[PDB]
Design a protein around this nucleic acid. Structure first.
Lengths: 273, 273
DNA sequence: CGGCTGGAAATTTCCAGCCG
DNA sequence: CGGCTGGAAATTTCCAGCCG
């Protein structure tokens, strides 16, 4: 029999709570889960109906897939994994109640120790490999279903892993926002210096992207002009038509190179010089 | 004889480094230091020359001078205090390799037990009156010099403290710096909105203080206008005289109410409306 | 109306670029 | 080298506006 993932966890949007951030750790939602239409990581077991159990371990994003040092927490969880006895009355299973608790880089080796002890190693990565560089900001759910064989004896199906989940409370995964701007208008020749206040960005990865219908231009600044990740001082780019004779609304917005990700558009209105 | 401080340690702009950064910290410069002519904490022993020793403990900022949890680190340091043989043919003493290593709040209790065990209590504060919170953002060096008397026996002179050395890590005890400003000129009628980029302030304890001979005025903004502690968007106050006939350069600077502290003055040049 | 939880901040580690 | 730095991560604790 074989497990299928008919609903992957939302790749970006969840934040790993340290075992200190309050009482909640979250509840990983599905790839198409909205503030109205809530979906969740669901699997389908092809070719089997009846008694069985499900275990959701966490494993490294990358190919040598060792058990991750972070923990899964919530209903039915224990020692960093989930484990609920499946339902015979259904074949499509959803989990609308699981959270990803990140551990401190300091307590990483005490995490993996517990991985060993509790026999949590979906892909039985030999001990000599428990060592290495654990990418703490990306995990993969590893659904390991157990159904019965013809003789009724428990039959462990192969492991099925999801695509990476990503900790929002991380450098590049946080959202883009333009809180304030000293000026929303300027000259079509550009050159106007603009002070834009935003949310924590990375001077190494950020852009002020200007756009209109068929037009495109970046504002000019540098890493030096990105004051405390939360303010950028740059200069507007020239407009398409330089010798304007009337205004032209275009839209200004923050753009992150790495992801091609944008912020809500702030109307900028180029004017005749 | 009696010790005096010919040169106090620079009160601000220096962050205290933790052990996780090194058993050696930058080194406290003299209050009168500048890129060109470097200065260091110096003391003068009035009425004595020849054999002697000098210990530099750290003690709390306010009156009951309990030995601080923090520790001094650098040449000739050990157990959180400096110690060294006084030059016997000189009377002015410089200390150019002194660093302040801040302990973690958690490790505070281990800190003071070390003060006890090593008998570091310049002002002999009893265990009774040692109890209390320790302001970990402000310390004071406490030079304890020992010379000999004519008969020849070691004579411990009384203790002399410096003025607080403030850890920049703390925005209320830190050095107000104005990094950038979109405009340094405006109208005598005021009203010009200004975007000023500074170092970590505290929305509810910061001010943009304008000034001139017989004139002072605050800029208008609110806590809502203090973006993520490192930017203030305010509006310039009217000048003393609205009938200017030519630029009148006053000085703009950050002021912190809690301690009436100021930042280096940025020239602002009011102009005729 | 006070107890629950983002968003702000305070606190601690780590790191790159540098300058003598 | 290495020690400085200054800046930003990593982590933890704060806090005000919810909410009921």
């Amino acid at each position: 029999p074989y497990v299928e993932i008919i609903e992957q966890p939302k790749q970006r949007g969840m934040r790993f709570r340290y075992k200190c951030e309050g009482r909640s750790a979250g509840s990983i939602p599905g790839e198409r889960s909205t503030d109205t239409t809530k979906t969740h990581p669901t699997i389908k077991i092809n070719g089997y109906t009846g008694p069985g159990t499900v275990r959701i371990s966490l494993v490294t994003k990358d190919p040598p897939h060792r058990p991750h040092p972070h923990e899964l927490v919530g209903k039915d969880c224990r020692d960093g994994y989930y484990e609920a006895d499946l339902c015979p009355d259904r074949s499509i299973h959803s989990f609308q109640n699981l959270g990803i608790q990140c551990v401190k880089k300091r307590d990483l080796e005490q995490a993996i120790s517990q991985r060993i002890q509790t026999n949590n190693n979906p892909f039985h990565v030999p001990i000599e490999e428990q060592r290495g560089d654990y990418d703490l900001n990306a995990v993969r759910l590893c659904f390991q279903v157990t159904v019965r064989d013809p003789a009724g004896r428990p039959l462990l199906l192969t492991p099925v892993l999801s695509h990476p989940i990503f900790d929002n409370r991380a450098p590049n995964t946080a959202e883009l926002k333009i809180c304030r701007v000293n000026r929303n208008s300027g000259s079509c020749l550009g050159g106007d210096e603009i002070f834009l206040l935003c949310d924590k960005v990375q001077k190494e990865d950020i852009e002020v992207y200007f756009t209109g219908p068929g037009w495109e231009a970046r504002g000019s600044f540098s890493q030096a002009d990105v004051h405390r990740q939360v303010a950028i001082v740059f200069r507007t780019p020239p407009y398409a038509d330089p010798s304007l004779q009337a205004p032209v609304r275009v839209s200004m917005q923050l753009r992150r190179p790495s992801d091609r990700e944008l912020s809500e558009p702030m109307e900028f209105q180029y004017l005749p010089d």
